[PDB]
Design a binder for this molecule. Structure first.
Ligand SMILES: CN1C(=O)[C@@](c2ccc(OC(F)F)cc2)(c2ccc(F)c(C#CCCCF)c2)N=C1N
Length: 368
């Protein structure tokens, strides 16, 4: 998997993308790695934010499925045309797949100005594919057509323009050099999103003491296509109160805590130690057993030395977005219906951690 290391790039808050080629001859595009959706959806017509796009006309191997797709969603919308073509990942496995491609012809608030990607690689399951679950997701095609093992892993690394970020998507395996210590696994509750179960939450060692159903209300998911840790309303309010209290030696405006206003210190003086660590305890493979992943302010204050608060409110459940994933090497073990976490290879007092087991009772009752 040596050749797949550092195959991801992005700008802070604009997602991580992998280089792909579509069609014959190959057309090079940058594609968002998105565990929170299930379509391979690519810009296929001019757009003000797109500097290149997929040209079906130019591909000898393109096949029209003669059906459209319209996807309205919360933040925006897109419209397109379904078909198939040959798809490769130059810094991925040495294979070529015939995949479904939604060629986006019209969109609103979908593409991001300056992001440097032109499409999305939906890595989640067929249940949430558009227009419906009959449209085989890319990874499913890849596994069915090739000898690639049914697993992928993501090392998303942190670190005037938006700061450039990097990482690795290891397709078909686990690269031991990308993590230290043990890999701890949480069950995939249901194969639609990468749905998981959080059984408790601590801020600086202090239990939020909520009924665990609250942490998963109405679901909890692992989503590389979301920047923030997003939390259900009641959990969000409990969390910010706790973080405000720990960092009380300094005062910040409401705009900061609402994740919309930046906060600055002079270069090098960021008081990391006034901000608490946050531990999410995930359901273990064994009943009554959990493990915790612990994240630092360095993860949840996102650089814009100016930072935005990267924890925000959700009405669609918990979203463990890039800022959770950036602490860790994350294994999407589809074959064994489980997601692994270990401390990623990528300050002086604190470190991100993955630690277990911890005995917490009635974990199945945390669902919903
Ligand atoms: C939450 N989320 C989205 O809204 C979405 C998405 C993807 C496909 C969809 O339709 C499907 F049918 F093609 C609908 C929604 C998404 C859409 C547009 C975007 F610029 C981004 C992004 C980004 C970079 C910041 C976090 F990286 C994510 N991906 C996620 N995880």
């Amino acid at each position: 998997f040596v050749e797949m290391v550092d195959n991801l790039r992005g700008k802070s808050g604009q997602g991580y993308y992998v280089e792909m080629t579509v069609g014959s001859p190959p057309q090079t595009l940058n594609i968002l790695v998105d565990t929170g959706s299930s379509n391979f959806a690519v810009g296929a017509a001019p757009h003000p934010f797109l500097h290149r796009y997929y040209q079906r006309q130019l591909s000898s191997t393109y096949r029209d499925l003669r059906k459209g797709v319209y996807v309205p969603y919360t933040q925006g919308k897109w419209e397109g045309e379904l078909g198939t073509d040959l798809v490769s990942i130059p810094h991925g496995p040495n294979v070529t797949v015939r995949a479904n491609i939604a060629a986006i012809t019209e969109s609103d608030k979908f593409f991001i100005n300056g992001s440097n990607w032109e499409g999305i690689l939906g890595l989640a399951y067929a249940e949430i594919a558009r227009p419906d679950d009959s449209l085989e997701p890319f990874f499913d095609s890849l596994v069915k057509q090739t000898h690639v093992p049914n697993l992928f892993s993501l090392q998303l690394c942190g670190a005037e323009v938006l700061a450039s970020v990097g990482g690795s998507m290891i397709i078909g395996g686990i690269d031991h050099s990308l993590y230290t210590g043990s890999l701890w696994y949480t069950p995939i509750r249901r194969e639609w999103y990468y749905e998981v179960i959080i059984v408790r939450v601590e801020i600086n060692g202090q239990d939020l003491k909520m009924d665990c159903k609250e942490y998963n209300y109405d679901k909890s998911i692992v989503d590389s296509g979301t920047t923030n840790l997003r939390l259900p309303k009641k959990v969000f309010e409990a969390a910010v109160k706790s973080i405000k209290a720990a960092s009380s030696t300094e005062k910040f405006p409401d705009g900061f805590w609402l994740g919309e206003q930046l906060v600055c210190w002079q270069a090098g003086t960021t008081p990391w130690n006034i901000f608490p660590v946050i531990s999410l305890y995930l359901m273990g493979e064994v009943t009554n057993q959990s493990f915790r992943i612990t994240i630092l302010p360095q993860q949840y204050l996102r650089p814009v030395d100016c930072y935005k608060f990267a924890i925000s409110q959700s009405s669609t459940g918990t979203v463990m977005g890039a800022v959770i994933m950036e602490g860790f090497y994350v294994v999407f073990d589809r074959a064994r219906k489980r997601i692994g976490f270990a401390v990623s290879a990528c300050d002086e007092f604190r470190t991100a951690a993955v630690e277990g087991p911890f005995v917490t009772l009635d974990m199945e009752d945390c669902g919903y």
